[PDB]
Amino acid sequence: GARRLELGEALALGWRHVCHALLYAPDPGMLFGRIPLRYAILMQMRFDGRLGFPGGFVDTQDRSLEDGLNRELREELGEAAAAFRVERTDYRSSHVGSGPRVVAHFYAKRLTLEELLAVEAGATRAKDHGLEVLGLVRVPLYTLRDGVGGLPTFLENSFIGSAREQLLEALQDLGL
Amino acid sequence: ARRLELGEALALGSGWRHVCHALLYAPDPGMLFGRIPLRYAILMQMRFDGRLGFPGGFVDTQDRSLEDGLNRELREELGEAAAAFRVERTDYRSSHVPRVVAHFYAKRLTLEELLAVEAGATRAKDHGLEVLGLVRVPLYTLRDGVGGLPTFLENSFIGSAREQLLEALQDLGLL
Numbered sequence A: 001g002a003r004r005l006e007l008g009e010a011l012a013l014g015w016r017h018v019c020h021a022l023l024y025a026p027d028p029g030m031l032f033g034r035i036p037l038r039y040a041i042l043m044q045m046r047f048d049g050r051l052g053f054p055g056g057f058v059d060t061q062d063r064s065l066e067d068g069l070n071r072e073l074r075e076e077l078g079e080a081a082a083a084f085r086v087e088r089t090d091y092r093s094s095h096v097g098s099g100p101r102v103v104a105h106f107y108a109k110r111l112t113l114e115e116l117l118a119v120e121a122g123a124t125r126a127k128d129h130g131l132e133v134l135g136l137v138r139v140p141l142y143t144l145r146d147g148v149g150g151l152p153t154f155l156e157n158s159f160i161g162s163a164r165e166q167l168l169e170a171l172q173d174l175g176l
Numbered sequence B: 001a002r003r004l005e006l007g008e009a010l011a012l013g014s015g016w017r018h019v020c021h022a023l024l025y026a027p028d029p030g031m032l033f034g035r036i037p038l039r040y041a042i043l044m045q046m047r048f049d050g051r052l053g054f055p056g057g058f059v060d061t062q063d064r065s066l067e068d069g070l071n072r073e074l075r076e077e078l079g080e081a082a083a084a085f086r087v088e089r090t091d092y093r094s095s096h097v098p099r100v101v102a103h104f105y106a107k108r109l110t111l112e113e114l115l116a117v118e119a120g121a122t123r124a125k126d127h128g129l130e131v132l133g134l135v136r137v138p139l140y141t142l143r144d145g146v147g148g149l150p151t152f153l154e155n156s157f158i159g160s161a162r163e164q165l166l167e168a169l170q171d172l173g174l175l
């Protein structure tokens, strides 16, 4: 897919910069009792008809990449997002997007389960709800019985740009 | 799957199980970007297997009817905002065919009822467990031509929900 860049290497090009973020939180619940949920991971169904992570374009009124990311999260989720900040400490990888001079920045934030729920809960009151944002979904991590149902089936769905691959890496690296 | 009449499908042996699901929808005067008219908000959901489907579940013997069994599953899967209405036999659509025959419904609500339904749908009993969240079908197609609804239909669905969506979009002039 799109070439993997360094931050500064990509930051060098004077271009459209777009940041998205995976909010996760640890999950002691079990499906049916049997199945481990492990973590609760927040994606969203976009206006595209594709699955993906929240956030969006970085503009000229953004003091830093983070400012725009944290801005585009509040737009898409409402004021549950104002309980945290995704801090570049969270920055994971960059990819050259299919748009005219479009780099894509991927973040991953560890929230607590108690913060994460209130995001879902405040999502109908969001500014872009039923507009850019159609609906928040969780990611299934368990994959069982069928040997195909669960996560694998989930990843057969459509994903925006590089979200599938961003999602896979986060599961690998942050050990599963 | 393969179509059948309702009575035909009610005339069946003890080894058969029945399952009910309902397409909820409401008129929407809003527009995407203040330009693309939206039309209706049509709720679908992310299942435990990552297959896109409609609210609903098995009828089972303990519910008095198919409608009851739908409405109960609907309050479990969607939360207590589904108690604001009740999806009757006059909201039934079709019956399709392991040994199961699946019934599909379409219920037209207010915009305010359907919006109130999304807010409470995280407090639902099956949220996190059975259901992993709610979504709206985009009905528009974007100027690129691929985007919008067509790209939403590229997703992997459960049983015949796709057929049932495409059916429900044309059949009451949502297309």
Ligand SMILES: Nc1ncnc2c1ncn2[C@H]1O[C@H](COP(=O)(O)OP(=O)(O)OC[C@@H]2O[C@@H](O[C@H]3[C@@H](O)[C@@H](COP(=O)(O)OP(=O)(O)O)O[C@@H]3n3cnc4c(N)ncnc43)[C@@H](O)[C@@H]2O)[C@H](O)[C@@H]1O
Pocket (backbone or CB within 6 Å): A018, A020, A052, A053, A055, A056, A057, A058, A072, A095, A097, A098, A099, A104, A132, A160, A161, A162, A163, A166, B033, B142, B143, B144
């Ligand atoms: N992991 C990933 N990996 C990779 N790329 C990823 C990834 N995740 C997401 N992306 C996506 O991230 C980009 C933007 O997506 P978003 O996440 O939604 O960012 P966002 O929330 O800040 O805003 C979205 C934009 O809003 C729209 O704007 C309207 C409107 O303002 C109006 C005015 O447009 P302007 O040209 O004046 O706006 P500017 O773009 O110039 O600022 O027309 C736009 N529009 C409508 N249809 C089209 C079209 N077919 N082609 C181009 N533009 C279109 C679109 O241009 C954009 O999709 C690409 O779509 C790319 O696919």
Ligand SMILES: Nc1ncnc2c1ncn2[C@H]1O[C@H](COP(=O)(O)OP(=O)(O)OC[C@@H]2O[C@@H](O[C@H]3[C@@H](O)[C@@H](COP(=O)(O)OP(=O)(O)O)O[C@@H]3n3cnc4c(N)ncnc43)[C@@H](O)[C@@H]2O)[C@H](O)[C@@H]1O
Pocket (backbone or CB within 6 Å): A032, A144, A145, A146, A149, B019, B021, B053, B054, B056, B057, B058, B073, B096, B098, B100, B102, B130, B158, B159, B160, B161, B164
């Ligand atoms: N449009 C549609 N058109 C048509 N069919 C449709 C449509 N939409 C949904 N369906 C499906 O609605 C039926 C099930 O009801 P649901 O719609 O999911 O609503 P519901 O809330 O009652 O949930 C049914 C679930 O199924 C039950 O448990 C599972 C699981 O634990 C499992 C436990 O043992 P297994 O080893 O068999 O698990 P699997 O190997 O089967 O995955 O038994 C149930 N189950 C799991 N997978 C399947 C399958 N492919 N076919 C039939 N039953 C299945 C209940 O505990 C759950 O509630 C059929 O699975 C059917 O495929």
Ligand SMILES: [Cl-]
Pocket (backbone or CB within 6 Å): none
């Ligand atoms: Cl604004």
Ligand SMILES: [Mg+2]
Pocket (backbone or CB within 6 Å): A055, A056, A072, A075, A076, A128, A132
């Ligand atoms: Mg946005």
Ligand SMILES: [Mg+2]
Pocket (backbone or CB within 6 Å): A046, A054, A055, A056, A076, A132
């Ligand atoms: Mg977006």
Ligand SMILES: [Mg+2]
Pocket (backbone or CB within 6 Å): B057, B058, B073
């Ligand atoms: Mg059930």
Ligand SMILES: [Mg+2]
Pocket (backbone or CB within 6 Å): B056, B057, B073, B076, B077, B126, B130
């Ligand atoms: Mg259920």
Ligand code: NA
Pocket (backbone or CB within 6 Å): A056, A057, A072
């Ligand atoms: Na924006």
Ligand code: NA
Pocket (backbone or CB within 6 Å): B028, B029, B030, B037, B038, B039, B040
């Ligand atoms: Na409209």
